[PDB]
Amino acid sequence: SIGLAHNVTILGSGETTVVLGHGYGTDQSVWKLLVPYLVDDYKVLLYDHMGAGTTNPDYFDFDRYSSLEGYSYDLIAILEEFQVSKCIYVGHCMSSMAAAVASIFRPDLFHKLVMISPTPRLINTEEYYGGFEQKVMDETLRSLDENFKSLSLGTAPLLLACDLESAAMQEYCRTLFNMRPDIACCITRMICGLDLRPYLGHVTVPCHIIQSSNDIMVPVAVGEYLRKNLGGPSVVEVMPTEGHLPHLSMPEVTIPVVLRHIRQDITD
C-alpha cells in the first residue's frame, strides 16, 4: 500500500486530523517535539516523502520525482488511503508547496495549510528574487554528484544557522545522508529547478506562512510575496529565528508559533 511505502504513522484522537509533512533532508522524526502538543486534541498522520532514507529505493521513480507534482499526487493518495478530509496540513519547504499544489486539485482534503519556510522558486529573474543566480547554480550542479556530501556539509551550518558540531546539525546530517546518493541528487535538482509561481493564484485554501527572519534559502520578502499571490486568505508570521529548519534548530520559539497556526483559523 502507498501508506506502508511512505511509513505512515497515526497517533492521537479527535474529529480533526493534522497531517505532518517533513521537508528536504529530514523524515517524520523531525516532528518529535511538536507531537506531544497535538496528541490530546487531534488525530495526527505522519508520513515520509518518497526518497527519504527511510523509504525503499525500489519505489523511487526518477521521472516522477524530478518535478514536485509527483509528490502532490502521492500526497493525495496517502490522504485517501486513510480516508482523510479537511485536514490541517503542516509542511516544511517542498512539502508545504506540494500540499499547496495538491489542494488545487483536491481542496476538499485540506482545511488549511501551515507552511514552514516555503518558497515557490529559488532562481532569480529580473522581476523575482529567490536568492540564487542561475549561472552560479549551473556551475554548482554540474559537479553535484561527486561533491554531494562535501557541498552539503560545507553549506549546512549557514543553511541551518547552527554550528557544525551542534545537536541540530548532527540530526539533520543523519537523515540527509540516509538518502541514497542518486536519489538525493535527483531531489536536490528538483528543488533547485522549482517554479511554482503559476499555481499560486489558483490555491484557495487558507495558508499560514511561517518564516525565519534570516534564511539563506528564503528571502524574507518571499513570505510577503506568497501573501500577495496566493488565491485564498493567508497570514505571514516572521519569527525571531534564523535558519531554514527553525522547527529543528529553534523549537522553543518555533513550536509555539506552529501550534498557534494549527489551533487558530483565519477563516469561519
Author numbering: 3 to 270
The authors write:
Striga hermonthica is a root parasitic plant that infests cereals, decimating yields, particularly in sub‐Saharan Africa. High‐resolution X‐ray structures reveal that Triton X‐100 specifically plugs the catalytic pocket of ShHTL7.
We determined their structures by molecular replacement, using the ShHTL5 structure as a template 21. Triton bound to the deep active site pocket, formed by a double V‐shaped arrangement of helices α4–α5 and α6–α7. However, Triton remained at a distance of more than 8 Å from the catalytic serine S95 in the active site. Well‐ordered water molecules filled the space between Triton and the bottom of the active site pocket. The Triton polyethylene head group protruded out of the active site pocket. Five ethylene oxide units were visible in a relatively weak and poorly defined electron density, suggesting weak association of this moiety. In ShHTL7S95C, the sulfhydryl group in C95 was oxidized to a sulfinic acid, as confirmed by mass spectrometry, causing only a minor rearrangement of the H94 side chain in otherwise identical structures (RMSD of 0.108 Å).
